[PDB]
Amino acid sequence: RGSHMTPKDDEFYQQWQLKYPKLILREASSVSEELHKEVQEAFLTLHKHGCLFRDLVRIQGKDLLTPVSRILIGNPGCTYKYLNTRLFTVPWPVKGSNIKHTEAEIAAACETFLKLNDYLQIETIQALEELAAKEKADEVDIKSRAAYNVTLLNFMDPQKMPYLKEEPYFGMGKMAVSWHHDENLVDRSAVAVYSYSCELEGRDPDIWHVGFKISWDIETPGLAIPLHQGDCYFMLDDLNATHQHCVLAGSQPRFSSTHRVAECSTGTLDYILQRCQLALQNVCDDVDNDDVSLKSFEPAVLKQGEEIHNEVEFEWLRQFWFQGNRYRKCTDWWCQPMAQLEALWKKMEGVTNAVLHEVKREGLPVEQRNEILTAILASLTARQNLRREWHARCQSRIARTLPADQKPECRPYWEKDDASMPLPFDLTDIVSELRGQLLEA
Numbered sequence: 001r002g003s004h005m006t007p008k009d010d011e012f013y014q015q016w017q018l019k020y021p022k023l024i025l026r027e028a029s030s031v032s033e034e035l036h037k038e039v040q041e042a043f044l045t046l047h048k049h050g051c052l053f054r055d056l057v058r059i060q061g062k063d064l065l066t067p068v069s070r071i072l073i074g075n076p077g078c079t080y081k082y083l084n085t086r087l088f089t090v091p092w093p094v095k096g097s098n099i100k101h102t103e104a105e106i107a108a109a110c111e112t113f114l115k116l117n118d119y120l121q122i123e124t125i126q127a128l129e130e131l132a133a134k135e136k137a138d139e140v141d142i143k144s145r146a147a148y149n150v151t152l153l154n155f156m157d158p159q160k161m162p163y164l165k166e167e168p169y170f171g172m173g174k175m176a177v178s179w180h181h182d183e184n185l186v187d188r189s190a191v192a193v194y195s196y197s198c199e200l201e202g203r204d205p206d207i208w209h210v211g212f213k214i215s216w217d218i219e220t221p222g223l224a225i226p227l228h229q230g231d232c233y234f235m236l237d238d239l240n241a242t243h244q245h246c247v248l249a250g251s252q253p254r255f256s257s258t259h260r261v262a263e264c265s266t267g268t269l270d271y272i273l274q275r276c277q278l279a280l281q282n283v284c285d286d287v288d289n290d291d292v293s294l295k296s297f298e299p300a301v302l303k304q305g306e307e308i309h310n311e312v313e314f315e316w317l318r319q320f321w322f323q324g325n326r327y328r329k330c331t332d333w334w335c336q337p338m339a340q341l342e343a344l345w346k347k348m349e350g351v352t353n354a355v356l357h358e359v360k361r362e363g364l365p366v367e368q369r370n371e372i373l374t375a376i377l378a379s380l381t382a383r384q385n386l387r388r389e390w391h392a393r394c395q396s397r398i399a400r401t402l403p404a405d406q407k408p409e410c411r412p413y414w415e416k417d418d419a420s421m422p423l424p425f426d427l428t429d430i431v432s433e434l435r436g437q438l439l440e441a
């Protein structure tokens, strides 16, 4: 049978030392009391303002509201995509920055989680240095695998959330968060967790734990680590890759701050603006109007264009507004940036329209035409499929169930009669005709 260990078992510590040596635990005692005060107050203040939300996530074709509710705080302009959902940071006061976008208390709370972020980073570097020293018995690889750019805050009150699946392999009881890896992190990057609980026969049901197992493996007993108020733990190096973890609910409300190094090479505002500019290079930009005319109709430039159009629409606008407008509750940092990405995308609807006009044109040899179609067709079919997916996802029986405060908005969205927009929202007819054309004979 499947079993787990806790500090109650003699094997616990040796199983820890032998098969989870990259799991580190620093009890509340190792953390200054003033930091405990500022951090716990910050949690409570964010909860009081209604800043944490359950996400209407997606999993294997199903829309599911997270039991846990969350907020993501970190570097400005930075995102973190988990479960096909792109969380946008409410910014913290990282250097050379200013946020008139957040509220006094909320801004102070992000300040605090910045302080906590710095603290944990220092501990993580210390621990990775110790780890390397044991082994063999770069400095910059360590620096970068501890360089937390975000933190995902969690809240769950099990008493007002009586809907928890049981741990299915080791009898660890009730799961606030089931077995998973933390995804979309920088390779071998550490993860640090601050745990704030509002304080026989296996683990204690009343007390929050984090569960650990080896991937693919349910014969090796799992480890259930008890978490008391202010305990921190670190997942080092490849632990998050080779092991899975879950969060086992106790009986009392609990917050957590999960600091991570998000892989954001295609996940920052700067990055997505730069891609937009790149696409608009193919556009004569003397003036902003509806007479969009393109500098080139070379396949490669058109393919790239339609790809960037898809990127900004679906990984950026539809993601942001699917949660909308709940960010506005904590900050307005993303208000202008999202307006601007919407205007760039509008232009791109324009570009696509120039391309269609060009393919449906008199003096154009069918060879060049077919070149263009093969270059853009994949992108338009993906655009249609992803629009159906987002519209439907915006209308799930469960989507239309949570507060208007966070009802998904399907945006951008326009009716067939919408004269401001050059192309229909529904691309079915267009894609049909293009396919037909490429098959003539």
Ligand SMILES: O=C(O)c1ccnc(C(=O)O)c1
Residues within 6 Å of the ligand: 154, 177, 182, 193, 195, 210, 245, 247, 256, 258
């Ligand atoms: O609540 C936690 O301690 C925790 C730990 C690790 N991961 C998550 C998560 O939500 O991914 C939450």
Ligand SMILES: [Zn+2]
Residues within 6 Å of the ligand: 180, 181, 182, 245
């Ligand atoms: Zn996790």
